[PDB]
Amino acid sequence: GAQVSTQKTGAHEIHYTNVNYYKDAASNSANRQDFTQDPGKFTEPVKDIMIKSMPALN
Amino acid sequence: GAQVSTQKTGAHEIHYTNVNYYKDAASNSANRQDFTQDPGKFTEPVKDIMIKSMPALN
Amino acid sequence: GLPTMLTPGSNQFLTSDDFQSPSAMPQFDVTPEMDIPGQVNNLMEIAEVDSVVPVNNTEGKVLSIESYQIPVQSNSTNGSQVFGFPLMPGASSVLNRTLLGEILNYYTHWSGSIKLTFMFCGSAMATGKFLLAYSPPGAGAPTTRKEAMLGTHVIWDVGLQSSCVLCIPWISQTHYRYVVVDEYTAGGYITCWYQTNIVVPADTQSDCKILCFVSACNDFSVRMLKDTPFIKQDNFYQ
Amino acid sequence: VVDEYTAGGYITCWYQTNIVVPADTQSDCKILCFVSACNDFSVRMLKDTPFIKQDNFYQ
Amino acid sequence: KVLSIESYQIPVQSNSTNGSQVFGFPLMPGASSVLNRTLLGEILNYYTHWSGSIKLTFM
Amino acid sequence: FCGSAMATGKFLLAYSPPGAGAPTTRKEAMLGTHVIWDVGLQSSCVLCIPWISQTHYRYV
Amino acid sequence: IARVADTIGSGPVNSESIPALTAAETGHTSQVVPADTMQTRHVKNYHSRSESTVENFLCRSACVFYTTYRNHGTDGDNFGYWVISTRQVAQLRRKLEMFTYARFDLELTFVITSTQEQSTIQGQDSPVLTHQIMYVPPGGPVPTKVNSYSWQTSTNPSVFWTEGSAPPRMSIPFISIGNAYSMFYDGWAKFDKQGTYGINTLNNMGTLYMRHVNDGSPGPIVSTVRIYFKPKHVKTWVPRPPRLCQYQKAGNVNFEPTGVTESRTDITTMQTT
Amino acid sequence: SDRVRSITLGNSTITTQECANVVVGYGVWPTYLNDDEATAEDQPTQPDVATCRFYTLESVMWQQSSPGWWWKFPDALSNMGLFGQNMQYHYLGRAGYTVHVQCNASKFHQGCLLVVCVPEAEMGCATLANKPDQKSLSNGETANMFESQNSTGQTAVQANVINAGMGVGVGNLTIFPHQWINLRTNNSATIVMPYINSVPMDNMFRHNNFTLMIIPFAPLSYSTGATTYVPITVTVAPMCAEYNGLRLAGK
Amino acid sequence: SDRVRSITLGNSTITTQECANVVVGYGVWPTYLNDDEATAEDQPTQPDVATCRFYTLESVMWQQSSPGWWWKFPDALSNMGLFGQNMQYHYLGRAGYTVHVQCNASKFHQGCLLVVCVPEAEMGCATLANKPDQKSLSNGETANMFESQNSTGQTAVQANVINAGMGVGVGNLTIFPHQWINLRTNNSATIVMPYINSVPMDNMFRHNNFTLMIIPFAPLSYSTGATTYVPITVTVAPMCAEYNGLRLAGK
């Protein structure tokens, strides 16, 4: 049970291996590459869709 | 994910193994065997081909 | 050899670690295992067993068997209280020394429903109805039977079946509670009243005893092992 | 941080016309500014802030 | 104004001249005092490098 | 609302079934059935008094 | 990949669409890009937001406390204790308090250093020192002396460490009774609202105890233990504005009122700063 | 158009002809607690009509030097009809809120109000050693006023508006679900708040855990001869209110 | 609606919430000169971003007795950024123009402005024997004012507004591409002008060849207590500007 993942490399011109040693999931290392984004919660929390090009208010 | 490469040995009369441990590509070891050569940039930067046996200037 | 880097935690003795170590007695042949009765795999199998509660743990009764005996008698009024204590199985002195409470004191967090069984150890000619109530926190402890029936309760009718169970359901805002006393995780109050009187014929004893048992339900659980405040030591036993 | 090699420029606001108002109205008005990043914004090289300090442990 | 709610208020009024300035500040979201204490600037001060486009909304 | 076009107001039109007295403050009227009326381009507003009685009919 | 958006090409426009005009009263933050108010070129942006994730922003070891204990004591009374909290330091407290709720595992690290004290006990030749950090969860028996029975650690987790080696480290899971750690609490502890108000209501994490496992030598010695917290496997909820005023207490959010920003000369001075 | 809007909850209705939009929390509409999120075992109460309805608080009067106001919830609704009743007889509770702030002007009036709902708004005391007393934090149905200067008092709240009682930048409060009442644009603001907490249910009398703040960023202004009495009315409605832990009444 | 509009040219943008429409020349959008219409042989320059952008001229102040103003183009842009630069270094040039005249009022203000672009607007002198001097015809970025009475001066322009400096009827100027700013209706007027000339390209320093006139047909009016400073801003943008004949700079 070894996990081969992709290292953090540069763009515009590379794997590491991981084995878990302990029985608890808290003993693992950090989730350094959990890239998720949902900004709509805070920037567009309104009920109606509010298209950009249209006027906000009639 | 283990990489078996050829060691540096002598000519005229031999592998090592590599595993990456860290998540960043900068944590890796040096590229000791990146043998590339393009001397034409500095020694023949002229526009025309300039064949050797021919006279350089007419 | 293999290039290796030492990381923090090397050469440290953490008393709760899981590592392999060499055996000082190699190839030792242990005695064959035997089928002994009463194997225990979980401590929750011990907390789920009934144990008598010293509800009458008053100043003089505590050094006697009269601690467990809950006195009930025939009254001239109506709606009297029989007993009352808080739902703190780990901290309350009414519960923290039972099998359930003794196991809780090794842990920091508990959760689940509790059972409170009551056995009526009076005569067979005696009769009574009792209101066993539980009230979650937020208001005070009830002081009359009219305020106790608003909460969770069971009206107990004495008869051929001598026992009755008041199941204290798990009603909290968190998932776990602290074994120690904490205001954020208050538990509520258990109270018992007279739904009627102890009516007895002539030539019978009006005074009776009731017994309390406490055990955990199938949803009970504990967490975060700790040491008990119950056992102490000054120096090594010789 | 402020650096001359990476100067950013200047934001300015002017009057393209006047604030024209009818009678019985206030000629003085307020405007509010908001600042937020676009979908191509990014940061790099975590550091500590110069905004919070401490002399000794909070009791 | 800095100890008051009048810090956020940009005053505009009716003028007698033409082409006056209303405000002006430099594009330094991390170092300029006009920006380094907003949600965008407060996050920048934990980092050494930024990049991307900025929005400036005016109400 | 037969006032000016520059005037503005919000009004609380309330209905309260019987059993308690008539409300004497706005705090007691909002407990009942009501409609908050915002004046504007639409000049009118309807408060529908629903049929809440214990009998099917009532006496005139 | 936390890759930012590419810039799209845009030419001249003349139409009825008004991307620059909006209503900020709605609470909606406008989604205008630079390609809406000017002719842009096409840019293939390879910049990524990998460093502003909440895991990377928070997964840094930070010292949260240090205390001192001696070897001689009286009588003694030469040991250390810390009631665990994350609010006695300014730096880590402000990062954790950018959110209202957080769930994470911790990486706990210790840095123990010993110092020789002024004395006339020459000559001193002291063997290597061994320290014992004991963690007592809420309700457990507390050490009263430097040699009391509680240090047996039959069920209480303890780490033993000898000087000169790597600093000790262990992992702690998410241990709260709630579904998330609270950085902020807007209620009281008692139902009648008397007593403690605020985040101190939920502070029941426990206590750490430190001592020398060695018997005290003639030469006086004082050791200091530095605790370091590192959030791991993070999940944050409800971000809030960063703390502007300087902290005063650990139990509450009491502050001294502060200006919104640094002032400048006038509304048009470009010297900012 | 999109400026008109109506909201019907229970036997109550609110119409608005000049609004902006509805801000829905963090994109989450309030719902009932599910079986896999619940931990309390007794069957909860759901009045669903008698409690999930609109309640109007006490109005304030916007003046040219008003720093702002704040309410605590559900302490503001603790005496409002059957919603306050179920709060007293129950140990645990859970609700979301529709908040409707309403202020109309004359189209010659000016001023901009920030309307925001701050979850877990813990407030500091004016004396650094003490703690704010119970009344300074939440007066119930009555608004507590911000100050435009440093507060004094042993049990007082530090109500200087520049930090909003919390020790933050008041201009940074737009990170929470907020809206603006700009007198030239709209006369009302509405926010739908889901239940936010670190536990599935909580005691409604010793915890809030969100505050409603109304802060004028642009002051009220008008020329002489115009109406000078501009009130702000607040109308809140609990959504999907359920209750657990019935017992005697209190507090 | 159709009253809102935005125009993006270069790194510049103009938004208008109260417009009427766009008048596009004679139905012709400006374009680049084609191979079969060209006669100059060298490859032309096309900056295309640094020059085809919006430039704001100097504002004037509408008063109750203002007869009107006029600008000459591209003389008005002869010192505006890189557009003026390419004009100096080149013998020949060619452009079309978006013209945006902007004047806002208070909805209690009244007055109607005629905004027209007159191609080949040759103007007469006040002295019949002489010719108007260079400054009277075009002050560059500054507006030349019409008069509401006969002009005098040896080199002066006959700027009596009733003939519009050209010897015609001022009410007949609506034959050219025009618009109206009527303060009750709209605060801006925009006209897109193609390149009009008898040759494919011309020298931009000795020829215009269109003028922008702004003539109030209904005078400005308001009751006392209202704002009395009503300015008119002019923002022009060359479209599809190309240049031929590079040499030393001049004029």
Ligand SMILES: CCCCCCCCCCCCCCCC(=O)O
């Ligand atoms: C031998 C060492 C064991 C020590 C174990 C320490 C466990 C204590 C819990 C640490 C987590 C506290 C996080 C609280 C977060 C908050 O209050 O915001």
Ligand SMILES: CCCCCCCCCCCCCC(=O)O
């Ligand atoms: C961090 C790099 C770890 C390199 C691997 C060393 C640990 C032993 C790997 C053993 C792989 C076989 C176990 C398995 O089946 O998953």
Ligand SMILES: CCCCCCCCCCCCCC(=O)O
């Ligand atoms: C520098 C020599 C390294 C020798 C190998 C030690 C590290 C563990 C190797 C584990 C190989 C399996 C992992 C994989 O699948 O790639």
